[PDB]
Design a binder for this molecule. Sequence first.
Ligand SMILES: Nc1ncnc2c1ncn2[C@@H]1O[C@H](COP(=O)(O)OP(=O)(O)O)[C@@H](O)[C@H]1O
Ligand SMILES: Nc1ncnc2c1ncn2[C@@H]1O[C@H](COP(=O)(O)OP(=O)(O)O)[C@@H](O)[C@H]1O
Ligand SMILES: Nc1ncnc2c1ncn2[C@@H]1O[C@H](COP(=O)(O)OP(=O)(O)O)[C@@H](O)[C@H]1O
Ligand SMILES: Nc1ncnc2c1ncn2[C@@H]1O[C@H](COP(=O)(O)OP(=O)(O)O)[C@@H](O)[C@H]1O
Ligand SMILES: Nc1ncnc2c1ncn2[C@@H]1O[C@H](COP(=O)(O)OP(=O)(O)O)[C@@H](O)[C@H]1O
Lengths: 317, 310, 316, 296, 335, 333
Amino acid sequence: KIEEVKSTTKTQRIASHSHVKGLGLDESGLAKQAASGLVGQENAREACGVIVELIKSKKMAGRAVLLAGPPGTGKTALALAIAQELGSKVPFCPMVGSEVYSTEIKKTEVLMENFRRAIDVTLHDLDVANARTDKLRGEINKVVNKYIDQGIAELVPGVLFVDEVHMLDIECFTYLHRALESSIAPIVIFASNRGNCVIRGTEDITSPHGIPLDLLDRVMIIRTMLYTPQEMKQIIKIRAQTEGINISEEALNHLGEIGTKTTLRYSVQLLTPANLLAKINGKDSIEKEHVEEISELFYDAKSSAKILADQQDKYMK
Amino acid sequence: KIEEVKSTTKTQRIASHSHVKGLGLDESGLAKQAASGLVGQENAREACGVIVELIKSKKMAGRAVLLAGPPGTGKTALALAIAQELGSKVPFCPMVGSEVYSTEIKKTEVLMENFRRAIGLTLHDLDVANAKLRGEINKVVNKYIDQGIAELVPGVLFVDEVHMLDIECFTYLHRALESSIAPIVIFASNRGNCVIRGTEDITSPHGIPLDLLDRVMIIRTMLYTPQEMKQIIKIRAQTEGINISEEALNHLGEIGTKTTLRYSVQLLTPANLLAKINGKDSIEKEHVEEISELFYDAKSSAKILADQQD
Amino acid sequence: KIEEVKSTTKTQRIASHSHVKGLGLDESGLAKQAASGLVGQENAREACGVIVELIKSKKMAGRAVLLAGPPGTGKTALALAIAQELGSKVPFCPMVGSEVYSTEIKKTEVLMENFRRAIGLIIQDVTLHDLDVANADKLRGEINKVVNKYIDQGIAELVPGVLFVDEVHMLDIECFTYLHRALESSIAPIVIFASNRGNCVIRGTEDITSPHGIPLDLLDRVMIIRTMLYTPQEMKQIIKIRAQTEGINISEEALNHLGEIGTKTTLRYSVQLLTPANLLAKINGKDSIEKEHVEEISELFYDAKSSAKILADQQD
Amino acid sequence: GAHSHIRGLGLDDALEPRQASQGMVGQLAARRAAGVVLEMIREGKIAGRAVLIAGQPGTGKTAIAMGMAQALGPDTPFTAIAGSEIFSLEMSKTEALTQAFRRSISLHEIDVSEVREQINAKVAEWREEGKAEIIPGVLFIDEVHMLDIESFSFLNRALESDMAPVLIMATNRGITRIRGTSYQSPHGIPIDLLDRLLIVSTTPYSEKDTKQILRIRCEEEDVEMSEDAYTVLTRIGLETSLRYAIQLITAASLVCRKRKGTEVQVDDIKRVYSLFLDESRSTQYMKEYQDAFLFN
Amino acid sequence: TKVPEIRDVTRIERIGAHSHIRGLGLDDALEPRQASQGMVGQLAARRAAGVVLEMIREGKIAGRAVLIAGQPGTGKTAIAMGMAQALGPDTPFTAIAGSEIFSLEMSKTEALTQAFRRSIGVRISLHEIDVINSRTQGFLALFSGDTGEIKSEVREQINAKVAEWREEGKAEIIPGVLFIDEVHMLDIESFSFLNRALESDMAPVLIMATNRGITRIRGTSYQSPHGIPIDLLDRLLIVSTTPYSEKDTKQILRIRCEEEDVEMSEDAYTVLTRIGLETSLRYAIQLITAASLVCRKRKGTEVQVDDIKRVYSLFLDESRSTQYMKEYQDAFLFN
Amino acid sequence: TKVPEIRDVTRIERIGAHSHIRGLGLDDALEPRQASQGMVGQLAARRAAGVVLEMIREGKIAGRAVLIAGQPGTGKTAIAMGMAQALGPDTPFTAIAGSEIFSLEMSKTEALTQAFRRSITVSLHEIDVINSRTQGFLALFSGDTGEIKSEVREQINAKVAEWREEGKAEIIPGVLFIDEVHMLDIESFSFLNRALESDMAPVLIMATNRGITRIRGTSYQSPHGIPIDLLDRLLIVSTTPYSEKDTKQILRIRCEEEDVEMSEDAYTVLTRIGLETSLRYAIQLITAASLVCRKRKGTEVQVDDIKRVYSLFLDESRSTQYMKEYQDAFLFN
Ligand SMILES: Nc1ncnc2c1ncn2[C@@H]1O[C@H](COP(=O)(O)OP(=O)(O)O)[C@@H](O)[C@H]1O
Ligand SMILES: Nc1ncnc2c1ncn2[C@@H]1O[C@H](COP(=O)(O)OP(=O)(O)O)[C@@H](O)[C@H]1O
Ligand SMILES: Nc1ncnc2c1ncn2[C@@H]1O[C@H](COP(=O)(O)OP(=O)(O)O)[C@@H](O)[C@H]1O
Ligand SMILES: Nc1ncnc2c1ncn2[C@@H]1O[C@H](COP(=O)(O)OP(=O)(O)O)[C@@H](O)[C@H]1O
Ligand SMILES: Nc1ncnc2c1ncn2[C@@H]1O[C@H](COP(=O)(O)OP(=O)(O)O)[C@@H](O)[C@H]1O
């Protein structure tokens, strides 16, 4: 009855991918070096150019995509640019794998309210006005089915991104697999950065990517590679000019050699507290004196445990 | 009120023992070679003769029989010969130890309806004709025994795979055994030292606690010789209308020594139907060389699966 | 509405500590050799003289006392000696850490009924659990409406006692949170722990080793006192005092043999062999005990350290 | 799904496979051994027993039992559920397997908690009338080594019924730990059920047998392929799997269509091979990466 | 209201073997004489119970308990049976093992209260009053196969009933004797129930038996002597029973023949004693009933060495049997 | 309806050793002057708390949190306590531990929402001691515990929703301090992600002294016991252990806050125990060392009243080293 429930979206999740406009492809099907926001990664960007064809030509019945690569090589950006290729604000609901371990709400409702967040109006957008629950969705599904049989509202399939997939237990993989065999279901792109792992809940079954073998043979795997130190700076250069942060050339190359020791999500995270430190000294941009100062105040997670473990032996005798 | 509830018996467990009619012992208490179905097992069939006389003389007050032997060596065929010798039409219910783990029936109920499958007048068939309700049948079975129109007879309970029962079921097997009405409980194990299920730090012989092991008499069953396994399969060919040749049993005893005895009896009915497709009558040596290649067992399949995959 | 419910406080725990009168200190705070029943253990008795001053000077806001030492050294006799130095029969409630694991009773209803034993009130001393047995959360709430009305008029007075908690490595991590929350509220009693271990796993986490089995957020509010083992020239004096409290005459050569047992075993095992060495002495027609009696009971009955050796050595 | 070309096991009356019949190509032994069971069902002797089909995945383990329904009477039900399909959140292990036996009899279409108790009371005397008869099912279970003995003891219960369908199980694992206990057993099955069922073993495909299936499935998804493309596609069929070599069929029917060729050449199969990986290379790559990161 | 006449509901099959002992076998000065009142040996462990019998008489067992530490097969139950006879003409006795509290019909607090209810004797035991006023039972295999429920309010009805009969002088109460066999099966949610039940005045005296050394305490992960918590081991009196000799083994088997009215030859006693030194004493007693049945089959009622060398091969013992499956499975671990 | 007058439920004794911390003590160009508002030393970590103080004000901290990883006894709280003072003269600051959320009077949701409402004048949880249920009586009603229903929590969340634009009601997001972050399992780590999506949630400071450890709740290992989906949104400040000159200055402020005049001989021996054993033990001795001087009537703690209380009360390093020796001799035969 109410159809202006305009925005109810987790903006802070996809705030870091504001510059991703498209996949950046040619009409023949080839990838360019730098186009529509993305830079490099020519193999996985061409592979997503086939997935957007099998989605449109009605050939993705039952299949899914697993983006398997190291952490910090843009698995979220290639799964966000795959949503702008469908065209005109197709939804996108990212979630981590450890989100379903909530105590106050059951596991079967967290993964269900994420499926109704991906299917302009989303299906979970209509489910927050009518609250002011399983018994409510019987009549809300009815009226949108009433609208399409009338012939007004068109139904679109979204993109549903599950990162950190090895923490999903066996009782939730079966709930996904019962939904992949529907007709209106979205594409259920996974992400994993691990090899052979133990399925959570069986304690003896070693499986590829933490995924059961029932779902694994309905899965197309795309590999994302690491970044060169040349193409690493072009990622930080786009993120510096999208946020309004001027940066010197001699200081950008020092921020691009930090990302060859840590992940790339540590270098882009240092754009804000180095720029606000450069507002204290009364400058507009950041220099090598500022980036070298932040790198001695803030530590990455892997090199912060190495500080404590190398003092753990000397503190306890 | 209703006393014609004639038959409700799981007759697939005792369908492969349609030839055992008794223990087959003489008057003085020795064992013959081949009588009443039983073949071989001399030091185990005379042991079950003393169990039979210990029940009728009422000197089995709080004891049980444990048959410890390798699988394929007659642990069920001896436990049916006790139920056949100890009176006619005495009930018998062979259960497996992995049957108390259901998902809709509590272990109190799935063990209680197994005791009352053994006590005949059975106590279980009275509780299915009108279907607590069971307490109503108590006054019904009260009036039958004291008027003299019906007798009360206990049977035989056979618990196969006793190493898979947990510590809660053993105490229920120990309390309900110590009445003057409870049937004899025959165990069956083929393991040595195991861990009692439910304690996971304490090892005991045969997977059985020391409360129910120092009041239980053990009877050992030995393996089978290749001139005795040519006598067991000769009876199963006779009691099923399956003609067979001499050079077939010569090969069917060789597959018996390799895997077990219970697998060789399985290979009769598919080998007969392979001989009825070609339009023959008797199982020649081509069929037993064929069915032993088309089908497998639980050992040669698992060994050929671990190697081919790896 | 009653205040004469005199009989409480079960005496089977404190039956073996009737000779304890107090710490027995001078006016300068130095220890005596033998005073008020207590004999020896001078260094851990002066430290309790410091702690008993901190309760009166109100500087013990949110702290506790550990007592680390080998068993058979008297960490329960010391904690009883500072629950009598406060003044005029203040209460005392000892326990064992594995008593919060009852079947029907909830884990907090062993700790809540233990805290109400160590809070005391023509005026005589009763406790908050003393009133609970008389009238019987709703039955425990209406008792608090009686006592808070009394302090508003000026008759009753609340005093804190001593809650001795032994075997602290058996309390799980869901019970130390209660012991951290209801320790520093307004008038909670002095909580004294006890342990005889080193690095023990906190029960309920299975990965986090910790000193004495205690969470690290609680151990930094704890003053640790060490009780030492005894020497046989004063270990005889401990068994000499326990004989006069029960009325048992004994010889000189008996205590020199019983003192040798108290060094091979605990001290409490040598106090175990005082009543069944006297009951056998009356059968032989001897009022006083000779050496042959305590040699005979030390050969009949065994301790838990020596009896575990016999069943293990004869099994293989 | 990908078993739509099978219309039977492809046997004559003398029970010898002719190696190319009714969609089935290859599987010389197991298609013959499933003809013996087809006689044992018709003679009414399979009661108390079941079939187990051991072998690798990718080896006809679904299509053999699928062909065993159409080699039976002309309209016979078939339920192919996986092993870990019952471990759901909307239903427990006594709800899912109850709907499996109610499906292959269909009675579950007549059902769609005590609705199962009224229809069996309804069809009690409706069966004695004779207007619509009953038929048995060919109920399948894939990957049975993920079940536990709270469900294995249900299978012994449900097989007692006279209207029960012939159970057909499947696995690909050797001596495993039983789910729910602490003993090793063959095929993840307790020993009360291993001593009463027929075990069939399937051997993996050859070079010639794999090419005939890839030729069939191209004609079912109407793609014109080149001859040199086939001899390089079956070479992926022997090294990696068959479910991945069947996956480059559609995904290389778009690369040729995008460049307007209308015939899948050898270059396109050697292009989609470098885009979409498989589980043998992807698991190898992160293992090769996380070891190098572990060193320094 | 009217239940003194439904006196006794007992288990005759648990305590049916140790009925040849009437007393403990001690003099007036607490020294055994090696053959008296059923007892045959263990002179050190039979006069240490004389000190325990004094402390129950004088009133000093309140707060302690008894532990009997010995092998399986050297008479741990027969020593505690002597304390039941020597404490009066009728003192109750209950031989409940450790692994009988793990029942699926009642919890671990309803199976330990009834062991503390059977061992409180009142004169005109306390548990027999409760079993009759609850419901009507004690019937054939249907009531044994089924069960009943015990309402918790009936227990305080009768505990307050005897609280008015005792001080009148008509009813006299007597503390019994409780036996807990195999104490290394009790967990810490039951060891903290025995500490909360010995606090009363009308509580019985606890006697425990174990055959384990340093065993992990059940319920936690710390190892202690006997599998007993430390708050309980510092109150126990531990007695140690030794294995029997050859002179004591024939003397016990000589007593157990008149109880099962068998006449045995003087050659068969020498071979029944050698089995009692090889497997156990409980196994050699078990062969006696199964040896005379073979002799009554052969007409002449006198067991020679022929029968004892016959039923030794028919019925195995529980130690020799477990080798034959291990030696079979050792050939099964090899290919 | 009428609860502004009952706003006084503040922890005074637990956070009462950090009484001399009146801010970070920084200049206008972020440079510590080695002595400012009581804070002494820690030059590297105090500058990094100034940069975090910037990103809170402009509003760059939305979707981010702070983690302080260092050795125990190195001022992990005094840096996180001064950040409450430098951000404003009245900011709420609750310093609950990690093991204080595993209780039996509530769940892990009612014990973590109780921290997220205690750090948002009065705190927002302070309304729920009067507008929820009537308590505040004597000691056993602190031992007993009642619950605050969720329906009470939507009465107050809808009450102040229209008072925000009224002007008289102003909101101040404080700072929550979750000490010992590795004790929390991921049944509650997915509750910090739910509450940091709000528009009024405070800044979340945590602390740990553990290296690569195991995530409690699962079987995987991650740095600092924090899941890797939340480690990629943290600012990690590290502390450096004190020296022999910083430790002499810390106890001189604490003796001033406890009015005990000690000699300069006693100050160099109290940092000798502080360099060797611990820092939270050296300040623990100061009360129990003065009480012995008062009984000998000097009102000036000498060096003998330090070496007496050093022998009476032990520390955590010696109380387990001695029981290790006794359990070794007990093991020997
Ligand atoms: N090809 C790319 N084009 C533009 N930005 C990229 C690209 N790859 C990575 N990034 C940047 O790096 C970050 C990668 O995010 P995410 O996918 O979560 O890392 P990971 O790949 O480790 O999962 C994003 O913030 C994104 O802006
Ligand atoms: N200083 C002392 N004076 C007199 N008796 C003592 C003294 N110290 C210990 N005891 C006695 O020694 C026994 C040991 O008590 P305790 O140290 O609590 O041992 P545990 O901690 O092992 O239970 C107590 O019964 C007590 O009576
Ligand atoms: N003998 C065969 N003849 C024809 N097609 C086969 C044969 N074996 C397997 N296939 C095909 O291979 C694919 C594998 O299906 P499935 O039987 O599920 O694989 P698996 O062998 O792993 O069980 C199916 O599409 C099936 O059509
Ligand atoms: N000193 C003894 N006097 C009489 N009988 C004994 C003696 N020692 C052992 N027995 C006999 O040994 C058997 C063992 O009984 P019990 O004590 O229950 O077993 P265990 O010795 O294994 O604890 C009993 O039947 C008992 O008659
Ligand atoms: N740099 C510092 N400035 C001021 N006080 C400090 C400093 N470092 C430590 N302290 C003092 O030391 C004590 C340590 O407190 P806390 O930080 O909780 O210990 P930890 O370092 O183990 O977390 C506090 O009382 C604090 O006042």
